[PDB]
């Protein structure tokens, strides 16, 4: 498949109970109407599934959340500005992870993503809670 290099932004330092904004791009290469998706991974840890967005008419979207952030984290897109987004709050150690933006262009809707299919992943940017 083509080349597309994603670039998170945004990973640090926080506390447990702050709130801490994502975003991705591509550098180059991009994509339209693709089904795009947060995930997370430590050390020695299976790759979580987070998030995941795609477009919907309009200017609007479809969004589709694991348990494990229902209610925290929101995800959202800007066409235009050709990036994605994920507003962490309430945030807790067990968010501690690196964040990788993830897209599987097979997908037609945002709903559950597996790693494992993921056509395309970012660098990642490193997310860190302290109690």
Do not use: C, H
């Not at 994603?6 to 330092?13: A, H, I, N, P, Q």
């Amino acid at each position: 498949m083509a080349e597309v290099q994603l670039v998170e932004s945004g990973g640090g330092l926080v506390q447990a109970g702050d709130s801490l904004r994502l975003s991705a791009t591509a550098s180059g290469r991009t994509f339209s109407r693709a089904v795009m998706g947060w995930f997370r991974q430590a050390p020695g840890k299976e790759r979580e599934f987070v998030a995941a967005i795609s477009a919907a008419p309009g200017t609007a979207y479809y969004a589709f959340y694991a348990d494990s952030v229902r209610g925290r984290f929101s995800i959202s897109a800007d066409s235009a500005k050709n990036t994605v987004y994920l507003q962490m709050n309430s945030l807790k150690p067990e968010d501690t992870a690196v964040y990788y933006v993830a897209a599987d262009l097979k997908m037609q809707v945002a709903a559950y993503m597996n790693q494992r299919s993921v056509d395309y992943w970012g660098q990642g940017t490193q997310v860190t809670v302290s109690s």
